[PDB]
Structure formats: C-alpha cells, structure tokens
Paper text:
The DUF26-A and B domains in PDLP5 and 8 closely align, with root mean square deviations (r.m.s.d.s) of 1.6 and 1.2 Å when comparing 89 corresponding Cα atoms, respectively. Consistently, the ectodomains of PDLP5 and PDLP8 belonging to different phylogenetic clades closely align with an r.m.s.d. of ~1.6 Å when comparing 198 corresponding Cα atoms. These observations suggest that evolutionarily distant DUF26 tandem proteins likely share the conserved three-dimensional structure. Notably, Glu130 and Arg132 implicated in mannose binding in Gnk2 are replaced by Asp131 and Lys133 in the DUF-A of PDLP5, respectively. We next explored potential binding sites in the two molecules by analyzing sitewise ω for orthologs of PDLP5 and PDLP8. The different surface charge properties of related PDLPs from Arabidopsis suggest that different PDLPs and other DUF26-containing proteins sense a diverse set of ligands. Notably, we observed typical lectin-dimers in PDLP5 and PDLP8 crystals, in which two lectin domains dimerized along an extended antiparallel β-sheet.
The Domain of Unknown Function 26 (DUF26; Gnk2 or stress-antifungal domain; PF01657)18,19 is an extracellular domain harboring a conserved cysteine motif (C-8X-C-2X-C) in its core. We defined the structural relationship of tandem DUF26 domains by determining crystal structures of AtPDLP5 (residues 26–241) and AtPDLP8 (21–253) ectodomains to 1.25 and 1.95 Å resolution, respectively.
Residue numbers in the entry: 25 to 74, 78 to 237
Write the structure that this text describes.
C-alpha cells in the first residue's frame, strides 16, 4: 500500500526548542494534516523573513491516483515519520510510496529544481532483448509528455509512472520529467526496473511478467 518508506533527507542546520521556528514548523505540519482531508496537494508559508525566528515554507503531494481518506492517512503517517527521522532540522523532505512532504526555511515554492534526490536501479538487468528497451523508450517518452499531475504508461510488459509536484507550472513539469527520464536512462541503463526522484517530480518504470 501507500505507506512504505522510499527516502528522506534533512538539512544539516538544526533549530533549537522554544523558538518561533519550532512553533512555525508545528503550525505548518498541523496545516498539512488539516489540508489533507480534501486536497491531494497544497502549498504553505508560515511567518516572516529572518535563525530561530525564521519562516517555514513547505508542501505535500499525495499520489493523485488515490482516494481522499488514503491521502490523509499517508500524510498523518508522514508528519509523524518526518519528525522521527529529522528531529530538529530547519529543512526536511520525506517520500513514502503514497505521499511526499517537504519544508524548508527558504522559499522554494514554484521554482524549478531538477536536482537528484534519490534513485534506485533494480539489481536484475535485461540483456539481449532489444524489444524491452524499445518499449521502455516508448513508455518513458509518454511519461515525459505529462504537464499536470500523473501519467500511467504501458507498452508490452513495460509499465511506467510519473508524477509532478503540484507547485510546478506545465512547462516546468515537462522539463522536470525530461530530466527524470534522462537520469533513468543514464544511471540505470539496463535495469528491468528503476526509479528517479528529483526535487519537484519523479518517474519509475518496471517489467510486468519479467
Ligand atoms: C517580515 O517582517 C519584516 C520586519 O521584520 C518586514 O521587513 C517584511 O516586509 C515582512 N515580510 C513578510 C513576508 O511578512
């Protein structure tokens, strides 16, 4: 289901208890849970430019192909987990199968960012199967076409999934996924299955009966 751990990262810079930033962070996470109920994505800014007094900027993105109640469950789990693995971080991100949660002290909302956050290539490689690679190419090409939300793609026994985070413009979503696919090709050349997660999007492919 939608709750297994994919990756997490925290800022090296830590905040101290009983500061405005701690308060702002709590308020943010509380808002994320509230917003969960009836939106799959939302953006937030709490507070004022500063550091202990700093503003918080953040967002969450649930898998767009999942129900309301499932998005809330995932986000509640996410708020608990991100606190657990990143106790006193000024910045943190967390990707579960079902949802993504991010906050920082800098205003990253809406800005393109294609930096690599996480990737995994399957240990099993396909060899002597040109057809597999052509089908992968067709799938990845279709994923790259995404402008809003998510795409599921399929060609033969090759399946793919891509998602843009809801703070991106269409043009920026296309560019982000273009970089994802480039990365899938260049880091995981021969893998039967791989995933690449950038700052503002991700893309995965896998073999079905492979
Ligand atoms: C934050 O407060 C400072 C004064 O300390 C002010 O210069 C600035 O305009 C404010 N910005 C926001 C976003 O409230």
């Amino acid at each position: 289901e939608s709750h297994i751990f994919i990756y997490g990262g925290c800022s090296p810079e830590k905040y101290t208890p009983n500061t405005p930033f701690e308060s702002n962070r709590d308020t943010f996470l509380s808002s994320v849970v509230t917003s969960s109920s009836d939106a799959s994505f939302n953006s937030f800014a709490v507070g004022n430019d500063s550091s202990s007094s700093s503003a918080v900027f953040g967002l969450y993105q649930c898998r767009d192909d999942l129900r309301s109640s499932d998005c809330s469950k995932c986000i509640q789990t996410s708020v608990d987990q991100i606190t657990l693995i990143c106790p006193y971080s000024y910045g943190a991100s967390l990707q579960l199968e079902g949802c993504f949660l991010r906050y920082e002290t800098n205003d990253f909302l809406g800005k393109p960012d294609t930096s690599l956050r996480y990737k995994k290539c399957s240990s099993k490689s396909v060899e002597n199967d040109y057809d597999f690679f052509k089908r992968r190419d067709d799938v990845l090409s279709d994923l790259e076409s995404t402008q809003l939300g998510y795409k599921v793609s399929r060609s033969g026994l090759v399946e793919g999934y891509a998602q843009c985070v809801g703070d991106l413009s269409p043009s920026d979503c296309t560019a982000c996924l273009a970089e994802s696919v480039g990365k899938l090709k260049n880091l995981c050349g021969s893998a039967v299955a791989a995933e690449v997660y950038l700052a503002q999007c991700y893309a995965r492919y896998w073999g079905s009966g492979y």
